């Protein structure tokens, strides 16, 4: 029973991972073949860079401005910067923009979203002056609409690139996200790879590795069938016609529980998917963005993401129906997520109730083996030995995502981490009950000594990985090369 369940769990996980690896490799080969035919100095499609953010760090904002300015392309129509807040303390980033670009803040009287005239020419007079935006704080979603209107007024603009205020762009990042959409008329949206520059914290490095694995596996598998989810965000491109025709539905929608400043991206991706147009993802473009370094902040972000996914899963299935002979993989993955969550919860409950040493050791060894296989594949793909630290991601995943998902499902004097504390107390009580019930020493039994040896080996491996990670931080080997110059420049202020 338990052994059969563990075996089927392991074989299903291995098969799905192998299939996703094959799909990602096929997509990468197709993209490489497409790139091999790219002519030199290709500037067929114009780019309109739109930058939005709120409470951006001055150093991070300056670095992002330098990175987008350092981008090399044949022709750029303009750069659009939209700032969510217009308070006195919010003028710092506007003045920073005046240090890098022209002083064209031109504070609008009111946000254009609820304005009677939804035309960008009301607040903009010249298209070549790189106008800035200082709107009142009314939500991050409203900020993107103003930039979209500003980009849409120019008939010469054929596509736009969406980048966050904190993200860091490369020299060829802009070209790599606009080339794929031009070759195929069906393809209209391109997603760029996102990376985390800072990895000093154990949580930050695990989050970075998880993001890298997700982008290189799930995004590639989705792009093979051209059903990419969450295409938008940092380092993201959109064709002008689709965004022009779907701007109104994306902004006129209402929600019951909305954050003060969240920003909706899954809804935009789903709205793009309604038209049936195909979306591809490329890993060649590289973007660098920060990640939270606090456990509570990471838990809150995961809860918000889970709530958004649960809200949007209703409309996610409808998009797959529109596509002919396509989207079945997306629907299967969407069902697989909830099936996997329910099955892992049931397995955890069963192993906690039974409190059998043989079953727990077997399942923990299977989990360690599959995690080691995944880490080895990530190291082989990334050509870096730092991917072997992904084994410790299981602990933080189990301790954060599951309470976050439970809280998100329940939602749909903080009273946000209460469910997390209840889950921690429950798992601690289950562990105490398991260790108390199985309190004996019988070295004669082969099964008991085998379980003890296995658990001791697992603990030794975990301790060794923790020790090598800890000494790596002092050696500073685990520090990413990009963040070294960042902290050096911050020190040399």
């Amino acid at each position, epitope marked *: 029973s338990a052994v059969w369940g563990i075996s089927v769990y392991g074989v299903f996980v291995l098969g799905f991972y192998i299939a996703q690896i094959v799909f990602s490799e096929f997509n990468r080969m197709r993209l490489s073949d497409w790139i091999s035919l790219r002519p030199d100095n290709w500037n067929a499609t114009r780019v309109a860079v739109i930058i939005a953010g709120y409470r951006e760090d001055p150093f991070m904002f300056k670095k992002c401005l330098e990175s987008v300015r350092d*981008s090399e392309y044949g022709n750029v129509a303009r750069l659009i910067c939209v700032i969510d807040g217009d308070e006195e303390e919010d003028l710092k980033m506007a003045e920073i923009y005046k240090q890098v670009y022209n002083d064209n803040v031109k504070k609008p009287g009111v946000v254009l979203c609820e304005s009677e005239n939804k035309n960008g020419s009301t607040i903009d007079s010249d298209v070549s002056k790189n106008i800035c935006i200082l709107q009142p704080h009314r939500g991050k979603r409203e900020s993107l609409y103003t930039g979209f209107q500003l980009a849409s007024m120019d008939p010469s603009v054929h596509a736009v690139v969406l980048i966050d205020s904190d993200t860091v762009l490369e020299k060829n990042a802009i070209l790599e996200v606009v080339y794929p959409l031009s070759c195929d008329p069906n393809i209209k949206a391109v997603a760029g790879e996102c990376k985390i520059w800072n990895t000093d914290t154990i949580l930050s490095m695990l989050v970075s590795w998880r993001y890298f694995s997700a982008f290189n596996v799930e995004r590639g598998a989705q792009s093979l069938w051209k059903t990419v989810q969450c295409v938008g965000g940092p380092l993201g491109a959109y064709t002008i016609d689709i965004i022009n025709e779907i701007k109104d539905p994306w902004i006129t929608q209402t929600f019951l529980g909305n954050k003060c400043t969240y920003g909706d991206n899954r809804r935009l991706t789903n709205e793009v998917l309604m038209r049936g147009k195909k979306i591809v993802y490329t890993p060649f473009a590289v973007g660098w963005s920060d990640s939270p370094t606090n456990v509570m902040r990471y838990i809150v972000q995961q809860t918000r993401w889970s709530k958004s996914w649960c809200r949007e899963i209703w409309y996610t299935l409808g998009s797959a129906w529109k596509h002919g002979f396509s989207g079945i993989y997306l629907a299967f993955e969407c069902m697989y997520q909830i099936m996997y969550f329910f099955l892992v919860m049931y397995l955890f409950s069963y192993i906690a109730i039974k409190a059998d040493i043989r079953a727990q050791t077997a399942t923990v060894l299977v989990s360690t083996l599959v995690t080691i296989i995944k880490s080895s594949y990530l190291a082989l793909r990334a050509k870096n030995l730092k991917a072997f630290y992904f084994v410790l991601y299981t602990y933080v995943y189990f301790f954060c995502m599951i309470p976050a998902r439970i809280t998100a499902m329940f939602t749909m004097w903080a009273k946000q981490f209460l469910i997390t504390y209840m889950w921690w107390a429950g798992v601690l009580a289950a562990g105490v009950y398991s260790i108390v019930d199985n309190w004996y020493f019988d070295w004669a039994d082969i099964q008991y000594r085998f379980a003890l040896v296995g658990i001791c080996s697992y603990l030794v491996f975990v301790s060794i990985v923790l020790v090598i990670y800890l000494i790596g931080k002092i050696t500073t080997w685990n520090y990413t090369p990009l963040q070294k110059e960042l902290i050096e420049e911050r020190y040399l202020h």
Partner: nanobody
Amino acid sequence: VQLVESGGGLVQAGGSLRLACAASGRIFSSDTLAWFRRAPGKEREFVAASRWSGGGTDYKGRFTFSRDNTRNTMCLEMNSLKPEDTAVYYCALRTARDSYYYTRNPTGYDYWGQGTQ
């Protein structure tokens, strides 16, 4: 971003002269460098330019544009010089903060180097 260049001297019909324009600072990979045939005192005209990222602009084929892309300096070489062609050069630079379009107007250019023959 201050730009200084050295070179010039005797001019010959079959002779060739090489000019290099050194600048201090960061090009930002979006600034176009342009040369001018004569000083703006009476008459000035465009001869050649090329964006730092890539591409090139002439007027020809007698002017060659080379970018080191390592020590933030560039070199310009000319062949089959004419008596009316030789004059002072400025190797001016244009910032991309205002606009990304090819203005081609010397008025738009802000960074001006020292005029050396």
